[PDB]
Every structure is written in C-alpha cells, then in structure tokens.
Amino acid sequence: NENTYSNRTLMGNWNQ
Amino acid sequence: MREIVHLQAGQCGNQIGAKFWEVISDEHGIDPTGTYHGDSDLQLERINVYYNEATGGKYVPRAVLVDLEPGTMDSVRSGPFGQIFRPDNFVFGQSGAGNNWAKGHYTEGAELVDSVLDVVRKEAESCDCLQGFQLTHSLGGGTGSGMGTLLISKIREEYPDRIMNTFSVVPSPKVSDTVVEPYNATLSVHQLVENTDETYCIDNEALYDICFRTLKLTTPTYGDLNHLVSATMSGVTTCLRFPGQLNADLRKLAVNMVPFPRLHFFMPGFAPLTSRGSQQYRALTVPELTQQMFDAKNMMAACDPRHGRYLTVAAVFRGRMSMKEVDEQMLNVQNKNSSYFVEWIPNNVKTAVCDIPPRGLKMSATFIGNSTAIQELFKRISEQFTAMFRRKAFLHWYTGEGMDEMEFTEAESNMNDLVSEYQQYQ
Amino acid sequence: MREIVHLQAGQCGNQIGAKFWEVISDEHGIDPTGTYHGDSDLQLERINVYYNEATGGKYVPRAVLVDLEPGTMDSVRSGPFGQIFRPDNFVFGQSGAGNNWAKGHYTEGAELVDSVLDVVRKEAESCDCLQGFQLTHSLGGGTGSGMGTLLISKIREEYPDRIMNTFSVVPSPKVSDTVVEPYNATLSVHQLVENTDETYCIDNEALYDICFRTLKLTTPTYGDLNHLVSATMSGVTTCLRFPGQLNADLRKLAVNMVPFPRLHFFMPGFAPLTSRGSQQYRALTVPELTQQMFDAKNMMAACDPRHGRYLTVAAVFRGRMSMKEVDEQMLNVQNKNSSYFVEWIPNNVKTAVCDIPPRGLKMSATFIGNSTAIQELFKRISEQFTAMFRRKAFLHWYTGEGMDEMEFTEAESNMNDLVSEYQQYQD
Amino acid sequence: ERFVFIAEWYDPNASLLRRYELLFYPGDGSVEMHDVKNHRTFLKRTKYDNLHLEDLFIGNKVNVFSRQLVLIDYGDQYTARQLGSRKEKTLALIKPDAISKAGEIIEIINKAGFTITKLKMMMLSRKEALDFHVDHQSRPFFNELIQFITTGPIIAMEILRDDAICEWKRLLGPANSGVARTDASESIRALFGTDGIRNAAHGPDSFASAAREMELFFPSSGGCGPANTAKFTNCTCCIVKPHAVSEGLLGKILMAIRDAGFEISAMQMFNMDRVNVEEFYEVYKGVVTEYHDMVTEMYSGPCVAMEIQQNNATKTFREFCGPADPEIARHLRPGTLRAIFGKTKIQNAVHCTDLPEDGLLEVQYFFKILD
Amino acid sequence: PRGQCLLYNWEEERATNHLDQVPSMQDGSESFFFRHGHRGLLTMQLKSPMPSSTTQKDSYQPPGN
Amino acid sequence: MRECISIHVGQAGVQIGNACWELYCLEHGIQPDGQMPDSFNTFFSETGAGKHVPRAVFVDLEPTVIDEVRTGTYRQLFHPEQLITGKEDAANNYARGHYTIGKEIIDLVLDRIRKLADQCTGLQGFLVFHSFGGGTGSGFTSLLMERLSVDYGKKSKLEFSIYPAPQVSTAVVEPYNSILTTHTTLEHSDCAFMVDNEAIYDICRRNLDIERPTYTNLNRLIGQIVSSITASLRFDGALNVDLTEFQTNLVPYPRIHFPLATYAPVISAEKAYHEQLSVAEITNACFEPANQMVKCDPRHGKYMACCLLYRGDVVPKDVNAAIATIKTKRTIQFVDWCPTGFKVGINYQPPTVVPGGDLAKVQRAVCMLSNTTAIAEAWARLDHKFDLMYAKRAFVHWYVGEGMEEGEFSEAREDMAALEKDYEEVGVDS
Ligand SMILES: Nc1nc2c(ncn2[C@@H]2O[C@H](COP(=O)(O)OP(=O)(O)OP(=O)(O)O)[C@@H](O)[C@H]2O)c(=O)[nH]1
Ligand SMILES: Nc1nc2c(ncn2[C@@H]2O[C@H](COP(=O)(O)OP(=O)(O)O)[C@@H](O)[C@H]2O)c(=O)[nH]1
Numbered sequence A: 001n002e003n004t005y006s007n008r009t010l011m012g013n014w015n016q
Numbered sequence B: 001m002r003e004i005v006h007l008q009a010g011q012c013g014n015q016i017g018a019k020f021w022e023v024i025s026d027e028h029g030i031d032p033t034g035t036y037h038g039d040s041d042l043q044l045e046r047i048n049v050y051y052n053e054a055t056g057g058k059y060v061p062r063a064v065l066v067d068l069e070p071g072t073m074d075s076v077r078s079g080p081f082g083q084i085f086r087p088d089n090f091v092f093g094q095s096g097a098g099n100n101w102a103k104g105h106y107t108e109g110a111e112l113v114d115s116v117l118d119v120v121r122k123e124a125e126s127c128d129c130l131q132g133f134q135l136t137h138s139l140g141g142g143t144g145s146g147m148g149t150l151l152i153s154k155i156r157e158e159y160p161d162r163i164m165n166t167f168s169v170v171p172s173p174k175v176s177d178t179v180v181e182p183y184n185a186t187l188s189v190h191q192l193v194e195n196t197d198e199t200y201c202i203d204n205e206a207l208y209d210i211c212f213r214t215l216k217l218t219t220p221t222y223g224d225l226n227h228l229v230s231a232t233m234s235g236v237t238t239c240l241r242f243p244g245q246l247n248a249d250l251r252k253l254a255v256n257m258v259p260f261p262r263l264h265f266f267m268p269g270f271a272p273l274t275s276r277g278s279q280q281y282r283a284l285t286v287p288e289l290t291q292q293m294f295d296a297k298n299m300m301a302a303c304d305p306r307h308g309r310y311l312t313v314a315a316v317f318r319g320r321m322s323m324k325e326v327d328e329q330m331l332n333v334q335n336k337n338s339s340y341f342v343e344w345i346p347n348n349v350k351t352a353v354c355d356i357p358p359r360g361l362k363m364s365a366t367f368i369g370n371s372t373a374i375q376e377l378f379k380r381i382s383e384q385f386t387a388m389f390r391r392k393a394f395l396h397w398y399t400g401e402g403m404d405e406m407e408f409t410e411a412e413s414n415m416n417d418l419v420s421e422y423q424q425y426q
Numbered sequence C: 001m002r003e004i005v006h007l008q009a010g011q012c013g014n015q016i017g018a019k020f021w022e023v024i025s026d027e028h029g030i031d032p033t034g035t036y037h038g039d040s041d042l043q044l045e046r047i048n049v050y051y052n053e054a055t056g057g058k059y060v061p062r063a064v065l066v067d068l069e070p071g072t073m074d075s076v077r078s079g080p081f082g083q084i085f086r087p088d089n090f091v092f093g094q095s096g097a098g099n100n101w102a103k104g105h106y107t108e109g110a111e112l113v114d115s116v117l118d119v120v121r122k123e124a125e126s127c128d129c130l131q132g133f134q135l136t137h138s139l140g141g142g143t144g145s146g147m148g149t150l151l152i153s154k155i156r157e158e159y160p161d162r163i164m165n166t167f168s169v170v171p172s173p174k175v176s177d178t179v180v181e182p183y184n185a186t187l188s189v190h191q192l193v194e195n196t197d198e199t200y201c202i203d204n205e206a207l208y209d210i211c212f213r214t215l216k217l218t219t220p221t222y223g224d225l226n227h228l229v230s231a232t233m234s235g236v237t238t239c240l241r242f243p244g245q246l247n248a249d250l251r252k253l254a255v256n257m258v259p260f261p262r263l264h265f266f267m268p269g270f271a272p273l274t275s276r277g278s279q280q281y282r283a284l285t286v287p288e289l290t291q292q293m294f295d296a297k298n299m300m301a302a303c304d305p306r307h308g309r310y311l312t313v314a315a316v317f318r319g320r321m322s323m324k325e326v327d328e329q330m331l332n333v334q335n336k337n338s339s340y341f342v343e344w345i346p347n348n349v350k351t352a353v354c355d356i357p358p359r360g361l362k363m364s365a366t367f368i369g370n371s372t373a374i375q376e377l378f379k380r381i382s383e384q385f386t387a388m389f390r391r392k393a394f395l396h397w398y399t400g401e402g403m404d405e406m407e408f409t410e411a412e413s414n415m416n417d418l419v420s421e422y423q424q425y426q427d
Numbered sequence D: 001e002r003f004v005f006i007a008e009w010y011d012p013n014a015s016l017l018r019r020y021e022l023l024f025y026p027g028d029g030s031v032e033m034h035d036v037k038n039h040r041t042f043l044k045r046t047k048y049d050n051l052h053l054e055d056l057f058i059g060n061k062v063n064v065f066s067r068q069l070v071l072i073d074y075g076d077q078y079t080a081r082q083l084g085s086r087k088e089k090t091l092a093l094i095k096p097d098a099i100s101k102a103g104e105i106i107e108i109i110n111k112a113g114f115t116i117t118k119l120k121m122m123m124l125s126r127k128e129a130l131d132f133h134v135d136h137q138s139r140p141f142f143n144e145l146i147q148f149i150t151t152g153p154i155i156a157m158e159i160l161r162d163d164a165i166c167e168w169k170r171l172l173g174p175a176n177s178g179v180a181r182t183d184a185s186e187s188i189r190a191l192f193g194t195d196g197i198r199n200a201a202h203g204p205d206s207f208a209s210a211a212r213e214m215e216l217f218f219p220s221s222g223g224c225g226p227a228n229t230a231k232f233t234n235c236t237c238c239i240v241k242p243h244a245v246s247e248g249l250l251g252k253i254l255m256a257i258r259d260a261g262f263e264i265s266a267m268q269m270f271n272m273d274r275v276n277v278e279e280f281y282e283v284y285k286g287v288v289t290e291y292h293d294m295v296t297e298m299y300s301g302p303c304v305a306m307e308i309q310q311n312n313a314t315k316t317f318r319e320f321c322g323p324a325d326p327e328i329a330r331h332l333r334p335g336t337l338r339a340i341f342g343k344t345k346i347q348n349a350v351h352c353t354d355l356p357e358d359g360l361l362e363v364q365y366f367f368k369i370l371d
Numbered sequence E: 001p002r003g004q005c006l007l008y009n010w011e012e013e014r015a016t017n018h019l020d021q022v023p024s025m026q027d028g029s030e031s032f033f034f035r036h037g038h039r040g041l042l043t044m045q046l047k048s049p050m051p052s053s054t055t056q057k058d059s060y061q062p063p064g065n
Numbered sequence F: 001m002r003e004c005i006s007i008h009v010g011q012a013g014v015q016i017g018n019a020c021w022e023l024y025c026l027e028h029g030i031q032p033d034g035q036m037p038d039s040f041n042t043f044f045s046e047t048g049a050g051k052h053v054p055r056a057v058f059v060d061l062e063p064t065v066i067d068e069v070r071t072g073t074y075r076q077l078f079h080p081e082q083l084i085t086g087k088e089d090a091a092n093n094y095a096r097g098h099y100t101i102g103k104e105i106i107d108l109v110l111d112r113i114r115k116l117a118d119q120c121t122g123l124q125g126f127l128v129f130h131s132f133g134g135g136t137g138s139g140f141t142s143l144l145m146e147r148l149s150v151d152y153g154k155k156s157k158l159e160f161s162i163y164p165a166p167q168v169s170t171a172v173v174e175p176y177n178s179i180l181t182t183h184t185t186l187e188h189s190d191c192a193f194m195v196d197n198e199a200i201y202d203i204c205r206r207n208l209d210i211e212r213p214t215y216t217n218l219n220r221l222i223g224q225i226v227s228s229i230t231a232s233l234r235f236d237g238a239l240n241v242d243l244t245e246f247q248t249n250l251v252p253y254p255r256i257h258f259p260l261a262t263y264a265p266v267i268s269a270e271k272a273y274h275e276q277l278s279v280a281e282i283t284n285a286c287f288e289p290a291n292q293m294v295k296c297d298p299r300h301g302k303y304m305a306c307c308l309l310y311r312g313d314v315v316p317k318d319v320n321a322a323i324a325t326i327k328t329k330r331t332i333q334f335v336d337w338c339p340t341g342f343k344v345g346i347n348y349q350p351p352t353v354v355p356g357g358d359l360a361k362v363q364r365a366v367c368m369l370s371n372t373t374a375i376a377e378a379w380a381r382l383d384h385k386f387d388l389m390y391a392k393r394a395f396v397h398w399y400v401g402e403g404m405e406e407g408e409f410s411e412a413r414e415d416m417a418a419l420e421k422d423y424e425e426v427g428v429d430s
C-alpha cells in the first residue's frame, strides 16, 4: 500500500 | 511520489544497466553493503525515486533483471555493487536465446514473461505515485530486442497513462558484431515507434571516437563505454531528486520535445568531458560548456547534425551558475545557426538548471537532441535489410519457429514511413 | 530387549549361518576370539539382540546349529569364526538324511528334535523379552527340509504369540542338484504355509546371474553367494538394532506386507551392488538406489515380476539422508508403474529409515516384496510333482518309512489351492 | 599464482558470522571472493589497489569494498607453505636506560621489518622480576640486575617476522656494550649501551623460554598483568592511528614528541571494537558529519594509546598537533605533527584532546576501564 | 599374473589382481583359497570406522553462546 | 501460576518433543543442564537448587527413540520418570495399542499425570502430540483420551496431530488407523490443530530454499507454531488469548473441531533483509493457499471462524487496516451465519531464532488457525480409501486377532459417514 521510510527521506507525513 | 521502475534485458543492456548503479550510488552515498555512507543530508531527501528502504536501515534498488541465459546474471550479481539487488528480482531462464528475435519473443520468451511482469506488478503497486519506466536494451540482438520490445507492449497495456522511456543501443555501420543485425533491428522499431514515449539512441562507433579524440584514451575497453552512457542516464532525471533553480521532470521533457507521436528518438550527450593532459589548459565556464554541448564530435550517434535540421533541443545544466548567461548564450546559438534550426517553430531551445553538480566536477550539462539527421541512421538499416531480404537469407531460423514472411514486409514498410516524415518536415 | 533366536538347520543353513554370523560380527565389531574391538558406542548399546553376555566381556551368538550329519559340523567349527559358536549349541545326529523327506521327518529326524528342543527352550527363556524366531534351511535337502520344517511345527505350538521368519532356498530348474527334490519341495511347502508369518524365497539362478552381470566375478564360489544372502538378513532387522528417523521391527514388516494369512511369500533384493571397477565412478545417490531396487535383474528369486502384479512392497533404508528424496522416489515409481500394482489397495510402499550404514558403505537399502509372480515358482514344482506321481517314481524310498501315499495327494491338494488364490487376487 | 584465505565478516542484520574464501593474485593485484556455504561466487576478479601483499597475515583485518574481513585460516597447503612457514613471533624489551631512545629503537625495528602486534610500557614488581630472571637464579649479578630492572619502567613488545629469533638476536649482538662496539657498532646494544650490565635490550634465545616470557608478560588467560605507568594528573590523551602504525611512522612520532619536549607518561597498544570506539567518540556524534569515517578509521586496526604529560614545553599539545586537516596544517603551521604525518582529514595519524575538560575522562576510559 | 592377454574381461582382472593374487601356491587353487568369499565384496576401503554421526546428535547440539 | 501440561505420545510426539522443548529452553534462556545463567512457570517448575524441570510426559512403546533422548544433549534436564518406555512397539496396529499392549502401561502414565497435575497451582489444560498413522500414536491416544475425561472432567484438550499426506505415504494400513481413532476422539476432544508432511515439504523448498530436508527441518516449523499459540500465557501484550479462549471462538458445534494451521512469514536468512516485511504482507501470506500447512484448497470451501495471533513490533492500528482489506476480497468467502469471524491476540516478544536452523531473525510473525469446511475434502479422499480396501476384507485378521471385534470396523465407518453429512449442513447458506 505504502512504503514507510525513515523521517529524513521527505516521504509521507514527515512534517508532523 | 515520483517513482521510476528500472528493467534490464539483454547483455548490452545489463552491463550498461549494472554500470548505472555505481554512478548514482556514488552521488547518493550508498555503500556496496547497502548502508547510507555519505557527507550531506541533501542526498537522502529524495531516495524514494530509485531505492527502497528495507528493515535495518538498508537500501535496495527498484530494478528487475531478466535474461534468458544465467551467465550474465551471474556476471552482474558477482560485481562490486551487485549484492544490493533483490534476490527474487533475478528472473533467468535456462536456454540461450541464440541471438534470434523469434526465440526471445515467440517461444522461449513467451513462457518467461508471465514470471517477469509478476515481479514488476509487485514493484509498481507498492509505489505511491508512479512516474515512468526505464528499460536498457540493444537493437542489435535477439535477447535485448526480443524481450525488451515484448516487455514494452505488455506493460503499456497495463499502465497506459505513464511515460515509458527506454535507453537503446543502435546498430553501427562499421563495427558489425552480429551477422543478422539489420534483421533484428528492423523488427523492434516496428513496435518502438508505436508504444514508447521517449527513446534515446546510443551508438558503439560514436562512443569509440569520443574516447579516441576528446578523451585521448589509448585502449577504450568496455568498462569506459558504459560509464559515458551512465552519465546521461543520471543527468536527464536529476530534477526529480535534487532541488534546482528551474525544475523539469520527464513529462515536462515530454511535452516540450515531441510535436508528433512518431518523432521521439533523441540523440544524447554529456558536456564537461576533457582529456587528462589538458585539464589545466581548459577554462571551465558556461560559454565554454555550450560549445562542447553543440559539438558534433560529442554526440553519441553516427549522424552529422550539419546535414539536417533540429526540431527541439533541451539542456539540463547542473551546478551553481547564472541564468542570464545560460539563456543569452544558448540563444546566440540559435541566431547564428539560424538556417539549421527550423523556421516554423520559434524557440527550439529549452534550458533547465539544477544546483547540484555531480561527484568531483563543479558543472555538468547533458545535451539531448531531436534532429532530422537521425533519418540517415534509420536509412542505413533499411538498405542493409533489402540486400539480404531479396535473397531470403538467414530466414529459415525465423520461419522455422512460427514467424511469417508477411511480418517482415510490414516492418520495412513502417520503417520507410518513419524516414518519410523526417524528410517531410525538412 | 527384543532378542532374535537364529535357527540353523541342514547343510545349506549351516553355510548361510556361518556367513550370516560373520557379517554382523563385522557390523558390531566382534573379533573371532569373542571380545569387542570397536570405536563408537552405538554398536554396544544394542548387542543383546544377536549376542549373549558371558564373563570377561565375551559375546556369543544365540544360534542353534542342527544337522543329522557330523560332516559339515567340522567345517563350521574350522572356519574363520569357528571358535565363537558355543560348543553346547552343536546338536548333531549320527547318520545322514540322504535326501529323503520321510527319513528326516518321521524316523531319523524324530529322535534328534528332543535334544534340540531342550537347547531352544533353554535359550528362549534366557531372553528378557523374546522377539521371534529366524530359520535358514533348504527345501531340496533331507535334513533342512525334512527336519527343519518339523521344528517349525513344534515351535509354533509352544510359543504361539511370536513371529516366524524363514530364509528358505527354493529349488531351480537348471540348478537341479537332486533328482528327488520336487518330492521334498512339495512336502515342505505344505508345512510352511500354516506355521510361518514371513517367507523369503532365495534361489540360485538369481544369485548366479547377479555375479556375472553386476559383480562380474569370474569364479563365483558359494562364499560369494552366501554374502549376498547374509547382506539381506542383516538389512531386514537393521532398525531393530540401530537408531533412526523411522524404525520398523520384524512385526511391522509382517503387518504391512501380509493382507491375508496365506499370502506370506516374499521375494527379496539388496540395493547397492556394483562391480569393482565401478566403485570409484558411480555416485551413490537416493535415485540410484531406487533405480536398481525395482529392476528384475537385481531381484533375488527366479521369477519375473512383470509376469505378475505387486500386492505390497517394503523398503528398509540405511544411512544419513533426506526424507524428501526418499518419499518422492517411491511415490514417483508408483505413478509410472500404475499397471504393476493392484488397484484395490492404495499406498502400497512401506518406508523404513535407519542411521548406521554398513562398514565401507554410505547408503544401503534392502528390498522386500510380496508378489503374485511367486506363483510361477510353485507352478513349476507342482507340474514336476505330478509327473513322477503318475509313474510312482522313487516312491519306495517314501512309503517304506511310514508315510502313506495319501500324504502326497494332500500335499499337492493344498499347494494347488495356493496357486489358485494367488491368481484370483491378481485379476 | 594466487593466495587463498578464509575470512569472517559479521553481518549487521542477522548478527551472523559469515565465512568467505578470499583469493588474492599477487602478480597483478586483483581479488576474488567465493562463498563456502552457498558454493557460489561473491565477487569476480576486480583490481583492488588498497589491498596489498604486506597486509596479508593471519588474524588481520582488511576492508574489502566497505566490508571488514578478518582472516582466520589458511586456504591451502600452498599458501601455508609460502607464507606461514617462515613467520616467527618473538619478544623485545626496552630497558629503563633506553626509554629516552625507545622511539629510535622502535624506528630501527620498523626498518628491520618486524610487525608489532602487542605493545605495553609498564613497571615490573619484584615477583614479576624474579619470574623474568628465574634462569639467572644462581646469582652472578642478581642483586644489581634486579635493582636495575625494577628501578624504572620498561617497554615490552611482540614482534613478528621471518626468522624472528635469529634476526632479533643478531640485531642485539653481544651482551657487553664495549665488545659490541669493538665487533660491530651497528648493533642496538653497541649504539645505545653505556655498559655491559646496562645492555638497554633483551632477547629470548629458545622457543619454550620465549613462550614462558609471553605467558609471564602478556597473559593469554586475559587477566591483568603488571600495572601500567598511568599518572592520571596533568595529562592528556593522544592516539597513534592504525594507518600510521601500519605505515610505520611510530618511531618518527615518538622522536618528534621527544624533540618537542613533552614527556610520554604512558603508552600501550589496543585492538578496539566498534562499540568501544563509538563510546570513545560519543562527543563527536552530532558535531561532525564524518563521525562514522573517524569510527571506521579507528577500528580498522590496532591503535597505540598514549598518555602525554605536562603539555607545556613550548605550547599546548593541541596547537602542537595543529589544524585537523593536514593540507591546512602544511599551508599555515608547517611545524605541526599533522602537517608532517597527515594524509587526509579522516586519516591524520594523530588525535588530540580538543576539549581540555575531556582529557582525564579519555585517559580514564583507556588506561583504567580497558585495562 | 592374471588377465595378461586382451580378451574375456581382462580389465576387471587387472583391477583386482592385487586382491585375489595373495596366495603363493601354498593353497592349490583360487577356488580353494576363496571358498569363503573374495576379500573385498560389495564395498571397498576395507579398514573403515563406524560413524557416530546420528541425526539427532548432529541436530540437537549444545547451544554455545 | 498459569501452568500447561504437554503430552507427547508415539514416535512423532517424542521427535517433535526434541525440537519443541528446544525452543522452550531457549526462549527463557534455560541451559541444557537445567539451570538459568516468573514467566517460565508454565513449563518449568522451580526447585530449591535453582533447577528447572519440564512439565511434560513422553510415552512410547518402543524405547529405541527415547533412549536417544536419554543419551542426547538434554539428558540432565528431563525427569527420569517423565520418559516412559514400553518394551515392544504396537507394530502399526490399532488393536495392539488399544487393548493388548497399550493396556498394560496405561496405569503408570496416569500415576505420573496425577503427580504433575497436583503441583500445578492453576492448570489450564492438556496438549497432545501424536500421529494417526502409527500403532502407538493412534492406539494409545484413543484410550488415554477416554481415561483423561473420566478423571479430569471439563479441562481443555487440544491436539497437534500429524495426518497422512494425500500422495506421500509411509505405511499401508494408514486408512484403518485413521478411520478407527476418529470415532473415539470426536466426542473426547475440544479442538484439533491438524498438520501433515507433504505440505511442509513444499513450503521448506519454495520458501526456505532447502532442497533436501529431513524430519528435523519439519519438526522445528511445527515447534514454532506451538510457541506463538501459547505466547499469550507466557508474556504480556496489548490483548491476550488463552487456551480456554480460542476453544470458544473456533468451534461452533461439538462435532466440528478441526481447524487448519498456517504460519507466516517463512523465509531464509539471505532473502529476509531485501524484502520489507510489513504487517499486511505477513497477513496476506497466511490467506494464500500456497502457504497453507494442510494439503487442501480453501477456495473449494468456506471459512467459518478465524484466530489471529501476533508477536513483536506490531501496532494495533495496522492490524485493523490489514483485516479490513481482506474483507473486501472476493476470493475469500465466509458463511452467512458468521458476520464477525476474526479474533486478534497480540504479544510483544519477537520470535527467537534457533542457531543452526534456517528461519531468519524476524521482527513480527503471525499464526492463523481457521476453521474451514474445506477439510471435508481431506476426509472424502480417505473415506474413499477405506471402502476400496475393506471391500476385499484385507488386513482384518491382524485386527480381530488382538482382541477387538470386526464390528468396530463398520461402526467407525458410519460415524465418519454422519460426520461427512454434518459438514454440508453447516456450510449451506440460510
Ligand atoms: N513431520 C514429522 N512426522 C513424524 C515424525 N516422527 C514420526 N512422524 C510420523 O510418524 C509416521 C510413522 O509412524 P510412527 O509415528 O513412527 O508409528 P508409532 O506412532 O510410533 O506407532 P508404532 O511404530 O506402531 O509404535 C510417519 O508417517 C510420520 O508422518 C517427525 O519427527 N516429524
Ligand atoms: N557498451 C557495451 N556494448 C556492448 C557490450 N556487449 C555487447 N555490446 C554491443 O552489443 C552488440 C551486440 O548486441 P547483443 O549483446 O548480442 O544483443 P543481445 O543478444 O540482445 O544481448 C555489439 O555490437 C556490441 O557493440 C557491453 O558490455 N557494453
């Protein structure tokens, strides 16, 4: 469905 | 959120395709083990484009490796950077394709592609927002031109609203490392012009002369030719993963460049190249790169640009530089070479500037050209086809497997349709 | 534990028995003196099955060596392992049988069985938990067929809830080494079918053909043939003495391969056989054993399995190996050879696994097979029995000892009912 | 011709030790790797310039394409005959009268070609001196000999070379300093011996006796031997890096420090692990980006720890070492140790206490907790 | 010895000369000397140890830390 | 405080008990000597010398598989009286294991059950490991289940039993002992987790890439299922299950107590770290028929109940989103009378890797135990095999000669005739 990465990689809801 | 799927077919596309992975992992700071090992935070902000984060903080590529013989699959897996791929992405057969187009497309390739797109369907579904495809193959054989053309038509049926882009090595006039080579080239351009949105033609002779005169290499082995092609692969798509002054992804390089659906074969280039002896004697600035960009010796196809006309030219500049001297100087090329560019199109030039130069070199500029002079590369394959086809030579291997003679007449007719349109607009 | 009381009658049984107690002495590392000279402790944990403890760490066999003639007893006691058999276990008569059934079963074989039954009862009660009996003899002789089958009748009426296995030497047409033996073969199988749970028919054309095409020996003496018989005799009880992944004792073989009480005539084989020049070249692998297993050339009876249809087949494997390649191979051979198994019973193959292969070998497997092609063995003897009985040939050696001519009429009447019922379940 | 070695690598995910076959071709300097467990090729014949023939001995760690492989075995009888047959291991002693010239002695040994695997500067007690001189228990000169060996610190070194026993005894030469000066002045005892009793060196003669000396000095059981000469007052910490140790500039660093005038309070050799290196560089995490580069350089091999005293000959030790980048050091302060012995910012061959607060904590971490 | 001339299965005889040529006319015939059987049959490498390698013992080992 | 008593009878029970009790020793860090270097009290009873001894019973009629344990690695750990040996085996016969041979040693076992069950402060139930295809495993179990229900009234009795494979065979009379003992355990059991050997042979090749496995490779995969089932009683989690619990949520009727056991993910050490193991991709692996550990296809049948058990770094948020995707799949069909079919039980501890094994070190795992009407396909084949052999009255004299009547053959066929009639009356939509 969605590939969850680390916080650094600007992917998904990284902002919160 | 901008995703590119890579696919490797053939031997010529596997070695260039493998060599593509040492270049970008050097720019993004990935070890051969699989960890991030670099110096800047700015590399890791866009790693979703090419790589997949796995458990334990290790990165695997998004690429599918297919070839009918396991010899080259063992040659890529046993490389320096070969241990990062997925072990379930290695799809190989057990019988050689035999450099026969009908063996890669009709019988020995027809049982593999059920298991080939099944892996591709996994990697495409888990993406968030897919952007396109990248497939590396060669026109001169039966493996890269057998499954590469087949994987183009099967994927484009599933995913129509994308941009599927192939990097294809074309046959050459003088080298001739295959005997049935114009037969297998013509059978693929019949379906390259139909279901491909962007094709870049790479020549083996033109890469020899760049290495022999501009670089002044003594023995240009095959480890150097793949490293020239790998620079242009990583230069056309640098605006999808680096922040730039004026950003342009592949679909913006789609709308600007192709006026008509059947004219999308581009001539690429790389532009800060220099020799070893004359490093200290060359000035590195934007007006000097522009002359190297438009130089005929720096083009990767055996077509003279002075014997045709240019439809649309694009440039992806790289590094910290101005915008006025970029725009004023590559307009000066259009005014002075006024007769060479077309008259019914104003502004043949698109300019793009990114702010991240490559590893160790402070500037870069990849040339991409859409000219009418590529008809002569397509004319020479058509003429080589006629001399063998009128005697029906080498045609019991194709007709002995299920391929008809009426297929070959349609391919040459569509090839002559393609050379007619380039002259029509000239 | 589970002790096997080996019986040894006749001249043929003595020479098989002398070779049988030589192989499992090599297996357990027992020197000809009687002591133990081994290295691993897996050999000594189960040694009470075949050997009996004495003082000074001396192990002696639980074997009874019986014959009416003292001639072959001197050759047994003067062999390689002749000093390991107990001197009180040599029960010998004074006069030979002379290839006559009646002399060995009614007159001369009637007084010697009282001395044997004293020895057997002493050894049987000395076991902690007796497992069964095992006998080797010959149907074509006088002492082995005439008097060996008398002990089968006398043992079966004293210990009923046991198991009886025989390794009987069935006669052959071209190895006719006695002119009267269809009389002795017919009268022996009349006693065998009612008092025996497992029967392994061993022939001589079967063994002589093997040493020509498989071992390619130029002088195959009887010491070569008795090794192949003794290799089967140790490979059938190998899970009773050694650990493994899936054990199978002697009662487990009788349960699976005997669906009916008058179908207990097996027909054996041994899996790894190759010439001396082919030792270093052939790779011993699980399909290589199974390919040689089911072939009619390696099989140890003078009957072609393709002229009949298998009822039940058991295979006892030895050696460190993997169960997938084992379980796949006898399932695969059941698929191609679907016409060679009867359709009214599914999953006919018994699988048994040990861990200790024999010395100098890495994988071994013993083939035991019930088949309706063993009717071809009993049709040849029955047609020979009638041919003399029409003309009453050699009869005065029989009716002059006590038996009536009606015993010959009922011996063929029961034997003809056996060949009638093997044919019925084939079709 | 090729040399085969079996190597261990620790997988960071599975926490698994993995065994590989590493094949090196000394004729052309290219490597190849195979997998023992899977019987498949791991790396084809690739020209690797960093790996060299002098770095191939058993027990060594080599970084091959960002993997640290530890060589544990000999691949075959050919390489076992060609490399491991000649190599021998022996012990070297630096007496208290040669402490000032210990750097020059180490430099002489490095020119001789010995590989130092263990090093410790320490003080010997009376019972340890008795166990060291149990062969001289008949007492020809035992009182003054024990007094001389106990009155000052010594340096014990483990040195490996082909024909090590014979080469070390030939380097030392005659026991009498005057006799050595008369016969061959190039010997270590001849150059730095004031008298026969103060020979300023020591060398074992036989294999069993030498093994007894190692069991006395460097215990294989893992227990603590003789105590180090750690003063823990007015001191700083300095590390000779593994690349400098393998290059062989250790004697030059010792001579440069001695000519500067700072007193070496203590000196030892360590083979560190990644967690120990991380907790030593815990202050450098989050401050510099090449923290992992410094960590990997630190555990890539054995490092020589130093405690340096009083830091006030002319300047402090930090500004004596100079700027962290060797190019900056050469361009601005040409007399500094990093300018003389530095190659890269990552590999600059000396490390100094940047914070004056942290020097005692570093000395406590190295010379107390580790030993 | 035996199998000198090249006919009638000479290769196997040349291979097994050293096993079946141990008498020196003290025993009259090969049949008399090998009445008990040939020395190496159904196997080779006559001196060989019984393996202690049991499946359970090689599977469930003492788990080191 | 919550104690479980495990019974291992047969040859299958002991050889699983070598691999099952290896994991229990390694989960709590218990050495083979019996000493650690209160979560262990479910299997290990304290002694004043700090010695932990298992709460297990090992029963067989042949000591040739238990003497391997007594001379193995764990000889100092098992109690000298918790390994019970007969003298002669049942020899692949049901009547030997039920009436003649298995009657003589039944009194020693219940003497040892009563000693173990008295020290249990709170006993939850019994677990049984046996094989239908053996004389002891199907014969001794049949009367052991009778004399356990008489003494201990309403405790739980779960089963971990090996069924004969549809193609791979060991014995030849395995239809007889399969038919005869299910006439007994239908009314003397509560739930029966069911496995075989062909299905695990397939999984160990295509997933773990072991071409040539042995029983030890199969025993550990069975030994990993039992751990995650019991893992709620041992360790703490978000929400727990119990041996009393999933007995209530997996059987709707007393006659139907035959779920199907599946475990995921199974993968090697090499392939694990290139794939990303999300919570969705391990629960969409359990529903695939190619991963099921019983050789039957659930597309032919319809699910009736399901139990989901989780371990490791699992969030309760994404479990709810993963199950909600499954309920929209058309290829999975439920009965009309079960609108709510799932239960989730969550534990915190990630599974432990056995050194020398082939399974990788994972972070999350799941075991799915679904009641399904597609097990009637598995019994249609074997009920057909019983009729094809009983027609000619084969092997019956082995059974009537040990003490039981021939009339038990026709009655046990009518029991599983009516059991087959029950399964289509449950799977019919209302
Ligand atoms: N998967 C697996 N199956 C086993 C194992 N051990 C035994 N079995 C099963 O057991 C069957 C063989 O019958 P046994 O269990 O040995 O017979 P038994 O229960 O001991 O009964 P008796 O031998 O008569 O005493 C085989 O078909 C296997 O399926 C094991 O370790 N793993
Ligand atoms: N750049 C590059 N070109 C190659 C390589 N190997 C083959 N080629 C070119 O590919 C052409 C033959 O195509 P081929 O590899 O046989 O096609 P295939 O059978 O589909 O793999 C030759 O003319 C070569 O110039 C390589 O490693 N690098």
Ligand SMILES: Nc1nc2c(ncn2[C@@H]2O[C@H](COP(=O)(O)OP(=O)(O)O)[C@@H](O)[C@H]2O)c(=O)[nH]1
Residues within 6 Å of the ligand: C009, C010, C011, C012, C013, C015, C016, C097, C098, C099, C138, C140, C141, C142, C143, C144, C145, C169, C175, C176, C177, C178, C204, C207, C222, C225, C226
């Ligand atoms: N295979 C084999 N057959 C034997 C052996 N000894 C005797 N025979 C066979 O037994 C038959 C003769 O048996 P005989 O000695 O008369 O039996 P007995 O009268 O009861 O002692 C002959 O046909 C031989 O073929 C032997 O060691 N091996």
Ligand SMILES: [Mg+2]
Residues within 6 Å of the ligand: F010, F011, F060, F061, F062, F089, F090, F091, F134, F135, F136
């Ligand atoms: Mg059993």
